[PDB]
Amino acid sequence: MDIKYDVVIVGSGPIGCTYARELVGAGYKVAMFDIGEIDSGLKIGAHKKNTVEYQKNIDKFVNVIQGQLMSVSVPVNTLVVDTLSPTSWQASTFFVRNGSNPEQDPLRNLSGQAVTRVVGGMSTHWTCATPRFDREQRPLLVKDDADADDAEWDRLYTKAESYFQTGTDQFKESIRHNLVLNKLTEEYKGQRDFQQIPLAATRRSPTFVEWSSANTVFDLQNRPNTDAPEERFNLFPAVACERVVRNALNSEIESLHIHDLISGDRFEIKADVYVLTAGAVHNTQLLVNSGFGQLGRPNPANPPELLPSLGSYITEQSLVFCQTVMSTELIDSVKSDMTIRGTPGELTYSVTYTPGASTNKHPDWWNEKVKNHMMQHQEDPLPIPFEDPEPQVTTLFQPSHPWHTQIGRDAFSYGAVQQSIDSRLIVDWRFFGRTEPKEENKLWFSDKITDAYNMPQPTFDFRFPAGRTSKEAEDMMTDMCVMSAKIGGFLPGSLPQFMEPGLCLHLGGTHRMGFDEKEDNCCVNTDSRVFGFKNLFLGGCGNIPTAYGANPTLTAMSLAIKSCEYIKQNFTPSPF
Amino acid sequence: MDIKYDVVIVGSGPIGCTYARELVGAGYKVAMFDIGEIDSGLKIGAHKKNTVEYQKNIDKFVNVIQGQLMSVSVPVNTLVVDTLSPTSWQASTFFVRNGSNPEQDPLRNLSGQAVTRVVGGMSTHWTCATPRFDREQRPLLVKDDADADDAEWDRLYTKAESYFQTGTDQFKESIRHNLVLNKLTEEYKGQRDFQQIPLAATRRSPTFVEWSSANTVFDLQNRPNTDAPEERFNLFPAVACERVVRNALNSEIESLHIHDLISGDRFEIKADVYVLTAGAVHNTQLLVNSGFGQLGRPNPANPPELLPSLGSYITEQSLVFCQTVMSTELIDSVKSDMTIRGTPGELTYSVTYTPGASTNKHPDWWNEKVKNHMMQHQEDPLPIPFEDPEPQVTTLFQPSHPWHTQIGRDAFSYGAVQQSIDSRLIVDWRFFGRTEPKEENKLWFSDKITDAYNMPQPTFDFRFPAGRTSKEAEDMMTDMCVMSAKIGGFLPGSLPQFMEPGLCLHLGGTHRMGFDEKEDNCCVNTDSRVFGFKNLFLGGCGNIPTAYGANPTLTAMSLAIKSCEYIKQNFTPSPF
Amino acid sequence: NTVEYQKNIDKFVNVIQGQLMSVSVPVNTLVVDTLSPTSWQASTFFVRNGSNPEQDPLRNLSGQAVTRVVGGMSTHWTCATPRFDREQRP
Amino acid sequence: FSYGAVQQSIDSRLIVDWRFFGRTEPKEENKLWFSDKITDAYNMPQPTFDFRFPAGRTSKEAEDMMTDMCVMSAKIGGFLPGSLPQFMEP
Ligand SMILES: *Cc1cc2c(cc1C)Nc1c([nH]c(=O)[nH]c1=O)N2C[C@H](O)[C@H](O)[C@H](O)COP(=O)(O)OP(=O)(O)OC[C@H]1O[C@@H](n2cnc3c(N)ncnc32)[C@H](O)[C@@H]1O
Ligand SMILES: *Cc1cc2c(cc1C)Nc1c([nH]c(=O)[nH]c1=O)N2C[C@H](O)[C@H](O)[C@H](O)COP(=O)(O)OP(=O)(O)OC[C@H]1O[C@@H](n2cnc3c(N)ncnc32)[C@H](O)[C@@H]1O
Ligand SMILES: *Cc1cc2c(cc1C)Nc1c([nH]c(=O)[nH]c1=O)N2C[C@H](O)[C@H](O)[C@H](O)COP(=O)(O)OP(=O)(O)OC[C@H]1O[C@@H](n2cnc3c(N)ncnc32)[C@H](O)[C@@H]1O
Ligand SMILES: OC[C@H]1O[C@H](O)[C@H](F)[C@@H](O)[C@@H]1O
Ligand SMILES: OC[C@H]1O[C@H](O)[C@H](F)[C@@H](O)[C@@H]1O
């Protein structure tokens, strides 16, 4: 390993990989460190759902997600167990046990918040939904010129969409997708528009989708290599980055202190440019461990030297969820263009349709797939083919329905997987609310309790704010109940519910962007540069300072792209 | 991908890798195919528990196991869901839904039986317990010469242990391990012997154990490479192997028909030697799909032409389980040697001991870790260090207690993890019974229903035989209850129970070994060669024809080693 | 109408449950495959514990129950007595 | 007449129950009949139901009744975890 790089990036998630792709490509000498290890196959940091096996058994993938979601703060446990044998050892108190955080108020937590430590970060498991924010949800990159701001966002999002391979066509031939899309489109005719959820993914075959990931942004291969002989990049896994060292004036970072988890060695790495893309929780941790913000329980009477807004104004989305069982009317409608004679399972049975007829409700490709299913499988009481892909439907956030929606099938199931109801009939509903940024909603770090990596224990103090956030969240619930009913009734065991706070994993605003540190209560400027510091940048959803409902990663990547433009303008690459 | 090889091996689990290690090392041009993918880090086929993150969060690893255990045979669901909305599509019958298997009698199943399809097979998640079988549990390799039979098993087992890196001292300085070991040794003094579970594992650090896997046996890198420039090996993942093609004379295999899951194409691969190591269920399936045994529901009236014992005499072990909460007595004994000064928490408290004192109940390494824990953490009410490894205790199968036992902490938890009870108090108990082989116990494959890879659906017809197998299982349950109580009372939520049949994943005898096809009711001889066929071999637990309690993989590997000696004598490698 | 029930109203569900005897219970087909190998075990889902083998589980009023006490179900009911409007009324 | 375990963490003063009841079209095919072989606990012919909620108006109204309860109840408060909106056993 070297002493000296042009750029060091902490984290190999998709935002770290945006920095690598831009900067490695512009000829910089780059080092990237990740605390986790390579475990997606030979494609480093690729999506773990891209196996033939997982896509043939998609109900098993929730186990992969759960296997790499380590809860951020778990309050001390007060469950009463009073049926132990009298011979068994017991304490007299609910003591600090099993890694629990005694700092944590269990009634002001994001109990669902979790972090992932593997190369490629959470993008090794994510859903790949990559919608744009509309103006209402989106921070300003230019003030008092709406159209210049629009132009800037379009340019950045479009680039971000190409890095992720975002598209809205991958589910276009699914019967279930179109069944639900078309019904919703008809029902809300000229009140709401419906489309495919924009997905970072390329379809390989009718039965396989290559989901995008960090690896899609940047392959993570060490460089120079035969394909990139003039490029310079080293990935160092199993390396806990612990502190950036500030000069006395607080105007520059002088080194990054790391801990090699395999050898146990501790080094200081030198770079011209330090980029922190370790996640919304862990960027905050690392900065606090470095003397930014304030360590320990908040105390106003001791304002911090640097970045007093660090860990304040945190946001996380309210999430409501249910599943439905497709209505008889919609199932019957799948076979509306068919002529069905005789009795299934006998040689007199037949199913036909008229090709190209304009009274047909469905296209030929639909009617052919129904025909073939019904004729080849006459034991089956449903008209939907067995390998039909799932719906992937959304009506994006608008001011009159200020929530994001995802309607279809999600690998991240939240309860035991039902087996009594045919999976073809099941549609999932997830609506995501925006949360107002409020100073009192905080991520902070213990001065005494440490985590499994001996760094300061994260602790949340969060409640969904009264006023607009709370009113929207409940109207969002009612809207899900109202809309889902147009498709079918609720599946027992998946009735409408709010999910645990933070189960979303869309936390933002932990190290938020604005134009002015004081007036905008923020930590980085629009170049993602930490105020005061020449050479320290933050990347990730932690930057986003607004109340947003839609999935944030595309927006974070867009920001990282703009940040890299500043870097190219102000630092020169070392000669090869 | 060439068209011609010396040896083709189906499956990259530890038994296929044994064939690889032996025949690649001997100069053969070998190809190995696996229906699954490289998913598991840069060490191809390695244990997935070998990450810093999993060993810092071992309670998460159950998720990785669950995520790659795909149920073999799920009977049609008859759960009544009578609270759907009246507008939802509702079933009139319990029809065949969600990949369930209508051939399956739910009351004669191995419901717990499951398969793993990833490079390295189940050795990417297994517990790594590798005991030897004593005579009583073990098939004969030599007739009429018990001492010759024993010497041959010693020779094979010793190689096998070397390939897996089996050892019995990786947990020797664990306090919990010795706490339970010593207590059971004393309680059963002169009656039974206790020891560490033999484990395929090398300790690297006091908090990390490099668990062995297929990778340990054979690293799975394509050859030639720098380190082995005269060897020839190719691994082809994502290739479903479907049939071995018999010549009309049924004396030889002419090719292996494969389906490349990525391109979708099907090819015929030619080899001199064909080795099937696809696991106990899938070797059988591949054979039946190739014309061996009998496809479809068993029908005696029309006996099969080849291998009429295939899929018969199957054995699976009974498994009882519980967890206990450590007795007050044993916890207090942990600190028996300490001198304790003052009262916990101030600059004044002191904990000390005398190294070497004859009055000491525990060694110096034990007291030192204890002392240190009680001084670095005076708030903690327990004397067990936070980083102390789990117990790994067994008393091995004997005539007077004919069950294998594993006592400690298994990463394969069967219910939600308790967080109310301190984990350092918890000890798991897994006792495993042996099942007599009976012709009526069967694994067979549907002539109509197919699985996710369009192969004949597997179906169990199984019950634990009445008589000794059943009497022994119930006796085993009482023994766990009686033995466990010497350590502590049961943990609510983990009360003593029989696990689902097949949850063991120790299925044997599906393609069983013996000396004489007819007299021993078997499919392969002691070279693992399929009777009548010059160039087809089967490896794996499916070969083991006896009633066994202990974990079978080491014994399967031993048989594979012997098989390789035959191949090496009877086939010549192609020139390089 | 006891002081003790109206002081502990949460408890009266037990009284209701205790005198609702189910009308028709279909034959049970739950799989229990973790019995000890020594215990007597069914080969079939035979008619057990009062179940009715005539009853299709899927065309049932499973929640239907009856009460056999003097005063019948009025000994536990909710006492809601609305009139029907014409729409609902014979 | 509570349907699930009585929850204890939320102050009972905050809790409001909602029950909305639909009307069911009378249909000849919806039947209560009595076995000629099976008997009940008083040795009388065992009752058997053959019942589905009629398609059409009864079904439409039932789903609409659910939606109305989600809409109405939200004016008072959000759903209590464990008593989420659900159809009860027929
Ligand atoms: C788990 C999850 C996540 C999302 C979806 C579904 C599920 C179940 N679905 C999804 C998401 N977001 C979208 O916009 N759309 C979707 O459909 N999910 C969230 C998404 O996954 C995240 O927003 C995104 O990855 C964040 O990218 P990032 O800022 O690059 O952050 P990551 O957490 O992915 O990666 C950071 C990284 O750094 C490491 N690390 C952490 N601490 C350290 C230290 N101290 N030193 C070194 N490295 C560190 C990690 O190990 C990790 O790889
Ligand atoms: C899952 C597990 C299993 C074990 C333990 C714990 C758990 C949770 N613990 C354990 C075991 N056994 C031991 O002796 N001791 C213990 O502590 N477990 C069982 C052990 O894991 C197995 O006995 C062993 O791997 C079997 O080895 P194998 O005979 O080589 O078989 P695998 O199942 O490992 O590998 C088969 C392999 O071939 C593939 N495959 C399947 N079908 C096909 C077809 N048609 N074409 C091509 N390839 C195919 C798989 O994908 C797989 O990798
Ligand atoms: C259990 C229940 C019932 C009602 C509500 C709440 C609950 C949990 N609440 C309620 C009801 N109705 C309302 O209009 N408003 C609400 O708030 N419930 C229904 C109500 O309880 C019934 O509709 C009402 O009692 C019916 O009155 P009935 O026609 O007089 O019938 P009962 O079932 O009350 O009593 C009949 C009776 O005769 C007996 N019996 C049964 N078979 C025989 C035979 N062969 N021989 C002799 N006697 C027989 C019973 O034992 C019983 O006492
Ligand atoms: O569980 C909440 C999640 O639900 C959906 O899968 C979304 F796509 C994702 O952005 C989110 O994290
Ligand atoms: O859950 C059953 C499992 O329990 C223990 O882990 C044993 F090591 C293993 O051989 C077995 O498969």
Numbering used by the authors:
A (entry chain B), B (entry chain A): 43 to 618
C (entry chain D): 92 to 181
D (entry chain D): 454 to 543
The authors write:
In this context, Trametes multicolor pyranose 2-oxidase (TmP2O; EC 1.1.3.10; for a review, see) is of interest since it can oxidize both β-D-Glc and β-D-Gal to the corresponding 2-keto sugars, which are intermediates for production of D-fructose and D-tagatose. TmP2O is a homotetrameric enzyme produced by lignocellulolytic fungi and has been assigned a role in lignin degradation. The reaction catalyzed by TmP2O is of the ping-pong type involving a reductive and an oxidative half-reaction. Therefore, to evaluate and compare the productive and competing sugar-binding modes for oxidation of Glc and Gal, we used crystal-structure analysis of 2- and 3-fluorinated Glc and Gal derivatives bound to the TmP2O variants H167A, V546C, H450G and H450G/V546C.
The H450G/V546C variant combines the two mutations H450G and V546C, which individually promotes Gal turnover. However, the overall Glc-to-Gal selectivity ratio for the V546C mutant was increased relative to the wild type. By combining the two aforementioned mutations, H450G and V546C, a third enzyme variant was investigated that showed increased Gal conversion and decreased turnover of Glc accompanied by slightly increased binding constants for both substrates, leading to a Glc-to-Gal selectivity ratio that was decreased relative the wild type, but higher than for H450G. When the competing binding mode (3-oxidation) is concerned, there is a clear difference between the more “wild-type-like” variants H167A and V546C compared with the variants carrying the H450G replacement. That H450G and H450G/V546C show identical stabilization of the α-anomeric configuration of 2FGlc and 2FGal (3-oxidation mode of Glc and Gal), while V546C does not, supports that this is a unique property of introducing the His450→Gly replacement, and independent of the mutation at position 546. Since the structural integrity and conformation of Thr169 is crucial for proper wild-type catalytic activity, its involvement in coordinating the O1 hydroxyl group of 2FGlc in the H450G variants is interesting. Conceivably, this interaction leads to unfavorable conformational restriction of the threonine side chain, forming an α-anomeric trap for Thr169 that stabilizes the competing 3-oxidation binding mode, and may prevent the substrate from rapid dissociation and re-binding in a productive mode. This is expected to result in an overall lower turnover rate of Glc 2-oxidation for H450G and H450G/V546C relative to H167A and V546C, which is also the case. In the H450G/V546C mutant, the selectivity ratio with O2 as electron acceptor shows a 27-fold preference of Glc over Gal.
